[PDB]
Each structure stands twice: as structure tokens, then as C-alpha cells.
Amino acid sequence: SKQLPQAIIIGVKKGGTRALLEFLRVHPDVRAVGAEPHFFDRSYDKGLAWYRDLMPRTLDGQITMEKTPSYFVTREAPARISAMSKDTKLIVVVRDPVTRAISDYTQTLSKRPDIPTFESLTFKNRTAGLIDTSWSAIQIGIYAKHLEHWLRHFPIRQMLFVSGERLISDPAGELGRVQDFLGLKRIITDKHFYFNKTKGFPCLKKAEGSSRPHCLGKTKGRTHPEIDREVVRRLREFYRPFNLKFYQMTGHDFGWDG
Numbered sequence: 001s002k003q004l005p006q007a008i009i010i011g012v013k014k015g016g017t018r019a020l021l022e023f024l025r026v027h028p029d030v031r032a033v034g035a036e037p038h039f040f041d042r043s044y045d046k047g048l049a050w051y052r053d054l055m056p057r058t059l060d061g062q063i064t065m066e067k068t069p070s071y072f073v074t075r076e077a078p079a080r081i082s083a084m085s086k087d088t089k090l091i092v093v094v095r096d097p098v099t100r101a102i103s104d105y106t107q108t109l110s111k112r113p114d115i116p117t118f119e120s121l122t123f124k125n126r127t128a129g130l131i132d133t134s135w136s137a138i139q140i141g142i143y144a145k146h147l148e149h150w151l152r153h154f155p156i157r158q159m160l161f162v163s164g165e166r167l168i169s170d171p172a173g174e175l176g177r178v179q180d181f182l183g184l185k186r187i188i189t190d191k192h193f194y195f196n197k198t199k200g201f202p203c204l205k206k207a208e209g210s211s212r213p214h215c216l217g218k219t220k221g222r223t224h225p226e227i228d229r230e231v232v233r234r235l236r237e238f239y240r241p242f243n244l245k246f247y248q249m250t251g252h253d254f255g256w257d258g
């Protein structure tokens with residue numbers, strides 16, 4: 001029967017949310033929705049009967065999952081999800097905030113090519129190095145800011161933060177933690193993955209629902225544009241104090257600042 005997701009991948013955008021979901025779909029005890037529901041942010045009015053109807057069917061002991069990257073930054077998401085159930089497990093796939101802003105910009109550049117440069121959107125006042133905190137690309141990277149709001153409705157024990165960089169260099173190691181966090185037996189492993197030279201990322205030997213090798217679509221693995229390293233330095237400096245706070249809240253250093 002259909003059940004409401006006991007675990008959600010709530011963020012972040014461009015941290016590697018699809019990759020993680022697609023890898024978790026290999027486990028025999030994970031059933032997940034395909035496309036981003038965007039329920040708790042854009043379609044909450046439709047109610048939990050609509051939400052439950054999107055979910056796949058599951059046997060007993062199977063875990064239902066979804067991923068919507070905007071939840072982590074959408075203001076009302078914590079209260080609403082906890083309202084669904086106070087026990088929901090939450091996962092955040094985090095990434096270097098600066099690489100994430102560039103990946104975010106690169107996604108838009110693949111849709112509206114005429115947009116200004118990353119360096120002009122970066123600043124409100126280049127002459128003074130004042131960064132546009134209103135720009136969504138900047139704001140999503142301040143993980144500690146959004147994390148504080150989630151901890152008003154969830155114990156940090158029910159929240160797992162996955163390394164987006166380590167998801168690319170050692171998918172089997174990272175997914176070992178995620179399986180422990182969801183009470184799933186360690187099944188996903190190194191043999192499930194393989195590196196495709198021409199893609200640049202790990203791929204699945206057999207995806208869920210397929211017997212063939214499966215890499216991620218053309219929408220994942222984009223070539224970023226070349227960015228002024230002075231802006232990158234000024235962007236790493238902006239995030240540094242926020243990254244340090246995030247490390248303390250999570251008890252883990254994700255290596256973005258050394």
C-alpha cells in the first residue's frame with residue numbers, strides 16, 4: 001500500500017540530490033518518487049491525500065522517499081513536514097557553497113543563455129565587494145542560516161548531512177552512512193558503481209528498473225563557466241564564517257575551508 005514518506009531529501013539544490021536518490025533506489029527496501037513533488041512548497045494546498053497518491057506502493061519494512069531541493073530553503077517547510085509527522089528523517093546533500101552557486105548559475109545558463117555574467121550577479125557593489133545576499137544562488141549556500149530554522153522543529157539526530165564532494169569520489173562510502181541513518185542493511189556497495197571516463201562521474205552498473213549501465217542525464221554533470229578567481233576568493237571569504245558555524249552545528253568539517 002501507499003505510505004507517506006518516512007524520509008525526505010530536503011536539500012540542497014545542486015548538492016547532488018538526484019544522484020543520491022537514484023543510488024538509494026538500488027536498495028531493495030527503498031521506494032521513491034521519480035520527479036520532485038514540490039508538495040510542501042508549491043502545492044501544499046492540495047492536501048496530504050494528493051501527496052500520498054504520488055508515493056509508490058511499499059511492502060512492510062520498505063521505506064518511502066522523495067527529494068525536493070527547495071524544502072531546505074522554503075520558509076514554511078520545517079513546520080509543515082513536522083506536522084505530517086514529528087519523526088520524519090531528513091537528509092541534506094550539501095556541497096561547497098561557492099561551487100553550488102556556480103552550478104546553480106550554470107543550470108540557469110542552460111535555459112536562458114542571455115543572462116549577465118556570474119561576477120556581475122555576484123555583487124550589489126563590485127567596487128566595494130558587497131555581495132548580493134538577496135540573490136537566491138548566494139542565499140541557498142548559507143546552510144547554517146536555514147539549518148537553525150529546521151532545528152526548531154526537529155532534533156539534529158533525525159537530520160543527516162551528506163558530503164556532495166565525497167558522493168562523487170566515493171559513492172559507496174557516503175551511501176554506507178545513509179543506509180545506517182535509515183536503518184537499512186548495508187547492501188549498496190562499490191560493485192554497484194563504475195566510473196565513466198567520458199561522463200566524469202560515477203555511474204550505476206544497474207539502475208533500479210534497468211539491467212543496463214545508467215549514468216545521469218544531460219542535466220547532471222554540466223561544464224561550469226570560467227569564473228574570476230578574485231570573485232571566488234571574495235565568495236569563499238563571505239561563506240567562511242557561515243561554513244564554520246555549519247561545521248559546529250553538524251559536528252563535521254566538510255573540507256570547504258581546509
Ligand SMILES: Nc1ncnc2c1ncn2[C@@H]1O[C@H](COP(=O)(O)O)[C@@H](OP(=O)(O)O)[C@H]1O
Nearest residue numbers: 014015016017018019103201202216220221222
Ligand atoms: N554520479 C554523478 N553524476 C553526475 N552528477 C553528479 C553525480 N554525483 C553527484 N553529481 C552532482 O549533482 C549535481 C546536481 O545536483 P542536484 O541533482 O541536486 O541538482 C551536479 O552538479 P553539476 O552539474 O554542477 O556538476 C553534479 O555535480
Ligand code: NA
Nearest residue numbers: 104105107108
Ligand atoms: Na538556477
